[PDB]
Design a protein around this nucleic acid. Structure first.
Lengths: 136, 141, 38, 176, 164, 94
RNA sequence: GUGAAGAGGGAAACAACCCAGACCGCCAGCUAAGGUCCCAAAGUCAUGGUUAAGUGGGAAACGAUGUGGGAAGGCCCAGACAGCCAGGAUGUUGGCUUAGAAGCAGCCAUCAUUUAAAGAAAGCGUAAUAGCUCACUGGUCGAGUCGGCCUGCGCGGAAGAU
RNA sequence: GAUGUCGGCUCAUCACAUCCUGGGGCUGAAGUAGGUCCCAAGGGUAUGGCUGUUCGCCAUUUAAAGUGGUACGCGAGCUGG
């Protein structure tokens, strides 16, 4: 998984949100990997993507991460009753929002980072796109 | 594919140019015959020394007939001799067995001016430097 | 061949060509990595 | 197609004629030879025909390099033909010509009567090696193609009729 | 014009460095063999002779945007060009050291400071006197057209004996 | 040191702004300096594939609208929530 | 909202969908959602764009030299890019190891050199020493080609009880 | 207002993602034998035991010992342990 050092939360809701979280632009680098659709990432995937991109590049600048898990999510046992109660905590989720930018670089040479992120997109559950900033 | 290249390189001691094992396979593949190569090799003045590998490079045409250019001694033999050594360092750049002076390398380079193509007397020194370094000689005057 | 999809490049004369709707890597001296689909 | 837009490499002493998408090569030497290329745009010029882009069964120039290639193919066909030195590796398999018919097998002591169409003939110096004669670049390989289609060569060590592109490519086992 | 260091850098430098040369020898490439030219810049720098291997694609425009040595027969097809600004006899003597490894008869024609020279007549140089007498034997039009062409016919016995 | 063009536009409303995005055009604005917020339209594709150059932002801008050019430098970007096309750019006069 | 407490129209249909709110009668007409080759009422629609796969008209990741369009871009008739042919070089059959181990058996030097040329080598290879393709050079070669990106379409992923 | 169950037998049948021969690619396959592997539903596709048992354990057959489904197939079929 991915996880923080301390917490204030422990048994949060499934987390459906009305729409967006406003991060659609490139702002941490000059290029990135764009979400271009909504979903879940289970903390395990974030680690895998950052892990994946560093194995391709061998760190030739700095890596920017724009995804973090926040809500714990419960599951119940596959055998008995679901709906009645709320089971143990199973996994921690980052909710990815549409058009939201996932991973960025600038210090790394752009054509190598682009290849690093294409490879890292195969670890993702749905389609993504390379985005270039072209602006301040 | 072409199965026979031009200007095939060989470097062999005068006493090992007729038996096959020192030579490996390569002469046999390039259509050339080991006794004939031994006569053609015999012909130059400095290609008489036994145990000292003298470079000779032969060009073979399309019918397996070959014609032959005979050449002055290599840098590898003169650097080994000039540094007082008889044996390299193994792995160089970590292990070193001697040193060779810059003036010795330009006199060596003159003995090589028929097997070397470099422009200045310096160019010729520059190519043969890395020969010395492989055998564990520090290049400094 | 292997049953795998997504064709890869492994040598200089990977021409990669679609025969009756399955993409094969080409080999001419090395079919040790030839594929069927992609 | 860069190659749809070539000099076509046919002389004027071969007066090649247009017939819609059917193209017929005519002139001096050989036999009367043809080619079928669909979904193309054709200008006639006189005998160095010019091929350009179309969409019908082509994607845009898909056949236009083809037609250009195939017209010169037919032209080389009438002036001299193509390669013909055909060969086999292994023993028992035969490639041995006896008249009209070329005798070969899967390994066995009886042949499978592979026979030539008219306007091509063959003969053999030795029972492995074949010299094929005629006046089209299509046909000498077309009889070559059905000849390998009864015993194929074998990936590591060749065991069958080897022409142009062939099944024996060989491969390593050790290094490291 | 310019887009490269290896091809386009060499259209404005092939026939201007040899309109610039006292002798040049314009020979057939992929028939002199490329190897042999590399194992002969061994002896070639110990004479002051420069040799480039150069395509008919750089020669086909050396005539426009740029000047040429008034020859075009040896510009067509694959082309080697050997040339000197020092001791003119050496460009052609270098062209005889070729038969040991492949063949020396590979000259098509020659240029000399601008005048077209046929391949029967340029071996007078490849004898190699002193530079001065090599200059005496052949020039461009400044002298060879003037007084040399009568020597050429009265001395059809040998090429070395023909002079300018 | 890039060269773009624009056409004159003024909108406040939902129906108008959507009718640009429906058809692959979007708005931007050049504020401060000698003049007021000037609202303009731009094209989706003139900044995406007509250009993949860092100079739009690192260097000055020639922007042509009604034969005017004033020199401009870029400010923060707003991006589309479902594609990598440009939803809106802000600019300051330079 | 609709069904529940609504007919008809369209949807392989139902008790809830998309359109609408059945007074009835009318061999009248229009419009809606929906349709327009035949089943079946009207477009095998005119104009441009693209796929050769029954994809269309079942769906993802995804990958690649499958393919096109488009503006910006390296090369761009002064001649390309890939490829096929040819050279594939000089010190270097360097040092160690070894029959040979010579970029390519293993390990270290992984460089230098004449340069209009060749990486102390990208890929292969009789299983290894050999041999080989390969850019760049020079043949073939006289017009497009490929990387980025936006974008149409293809591909395999996409195998089940009548 | 429920179609009547297990295990075994009767009786089968349909989906092919084929147990097998058959055509064909690869192999870190020398040849051979194998592994790998696409194409393909046509046909053939075994039997006793102890136990109310599937599975179990044991012996055997054939070149061979399959995949998957059927109101946990079929009680307006059989037994009824």
């Amino acid at each position: 998984m991915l996880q923080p050092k301390r917490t204030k939360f422990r048994k949060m809701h499934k987390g459906r949100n009305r729409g967006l979280a406003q991060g659609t632009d490139v702002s941490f680098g000059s290029f990135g990997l764009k979400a271009v659709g909504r979903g879940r990432l289970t903390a395990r995937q974030i680690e895998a993507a950052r892990r994946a991109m560093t194995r391709a590049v061998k760190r030739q600048g700095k890596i920017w991460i724009r995804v973090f898990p926040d809500k714990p999510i419960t599951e119940k046992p596959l055998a008995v009753r679901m709906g009645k109660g709320k089971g143990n905590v199973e996994y921690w989720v980052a909710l990815i929002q549409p058009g939201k930018v996932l991973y960025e670089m600038d210090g790394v040479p752009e054509e190598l980072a682009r290849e690093a992120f294409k490879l890292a997109a195969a670890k993702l559950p749905i389609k993504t796109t390379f985005v270039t900033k072209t602006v301040m | 594919a072409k199965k026979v290249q031009a200007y095939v390189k060989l470097q062999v001691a005068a006493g090992m140019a007729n038996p096959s094992p020192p030579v490996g396979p390569a002469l046999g593949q390039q259509g050339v015959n080991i006794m004939e190569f031994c006569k053609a090799f015999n012909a130059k003045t400095d290609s008489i020394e036994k145990g000292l590998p003298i470079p000779v490079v032969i060009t073979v045409y399309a019918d397996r007939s070959f014609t032959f250019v005979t050449k002055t001694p290599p840098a590898a033999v003169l650097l080994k001799k000039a540094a007082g050594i008889k044996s390299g360092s193994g792995k160089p750049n970590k292990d070193k067995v001697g040193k060779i002076s810059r003036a010795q390398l330009q006199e060596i380079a003159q003995t090589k001016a028929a097997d070397m193509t470099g422009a200045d007397i310096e160019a010729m020194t520059r190519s043969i430097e890395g020969t010395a370094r492989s055998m564990g000689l520090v290049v400094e005057d | 061949m292997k049953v795998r999809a997504s064709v890869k490049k492994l040598c200089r004369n990977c021409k990669i060509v679609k025969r009756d709707g399955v993409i094969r890597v080409i080999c001419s001296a090395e079919p040790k990595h030839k594929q069927r689909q992609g | 197609s860069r190659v749809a837009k070539a000099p076509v490499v046919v002389p004027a002493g071969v007066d090649v004629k247009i017939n819609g998408q059917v193209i017929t090569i005519k002139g001096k030497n050989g036999e009367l030879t043809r080619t079928l290329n669909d979904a193309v745009e054709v200008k006639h010029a006189d005998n160095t025909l010019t091929f350009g882009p179309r969409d019908g069964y082509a994607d845009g120039w898909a056949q236009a390099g083809t037609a250009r290639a195939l017209l010169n193919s037919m032209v080389i066909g009438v002036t001299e033909g193509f390669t013909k030195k055909l060969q086999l590796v292994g023993v028992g398999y035969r490639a041995a010509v006896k008249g009209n018919v070329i005798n070969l097998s899967l390994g066995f002591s009886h042949p499978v009567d592979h026979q030539l169409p008219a306007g091509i003939t063959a003969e053999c110096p030795t029972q492995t090696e074949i010299v094929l004669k005629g006046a089209d670049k299509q046909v000498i390989g077309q009889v070559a193609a059905d000849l390998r289609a009864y015993r194929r060569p074998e990936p590591y060590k060749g065991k069958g009729v080897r022409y142009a592109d062939e099944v024996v490519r060989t491969k390593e086992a050790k290094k490291k | 014009a310019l887009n490269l260091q290896d091809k386009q850098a060499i259209v404005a430098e092939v026939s201007e460095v040899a309109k610039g040369a006292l002798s040049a020898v314009v020979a057939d490439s992929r028939g002199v063999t490329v190897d042999k030219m590399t194992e002969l810049r061994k002896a070639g720098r110990e004479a002051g002779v420069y040799m480039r291997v150069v395509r008919n694609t750089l020669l086909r425009r050396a005539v426009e945007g740029t000047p040429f040595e008034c020859l075009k027969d040896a510009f067509v097809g694959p082309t080697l060009i050997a040339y000197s600004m020092e001791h003119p006899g050496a460009a052609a003597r270098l062209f005889k050291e070729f038969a040991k490894a492949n063949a020396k008869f590979e000259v098509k024609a020659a240029a000399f400071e601008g005048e077209l020279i046929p391949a029967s007549q340029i071996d007078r140089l490849a004898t190699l006197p002193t530079y001065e007498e090599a200059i005496a034997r052949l020039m461009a039009t400044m002298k060879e057209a003037s007084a040399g062409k009568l020597v050429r016919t009265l001395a059809a016995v040998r090429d070395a004996k023909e002079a300018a | 040191m890039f060269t773009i063009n624009a056409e004159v536009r003024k909108e406040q409303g939902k129906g108008a702004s959507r009718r640009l995005r429906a058809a692959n055009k979007f708005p931007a604005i050049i504020y401060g300096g000698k003049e007021a917020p000037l609202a303009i339209e731009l094209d989706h594709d003139k900044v995406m594939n007509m250009q993949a150059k860092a100079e739009f932002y690192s260097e000055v801008l020639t922007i042509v609208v009604d034969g005017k050019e004033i020199k401009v430098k870029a400010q923060d970007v707003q991006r589309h929530p479902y594609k990598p096309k440009l939803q809106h750019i802000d600019f300051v006069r330079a």
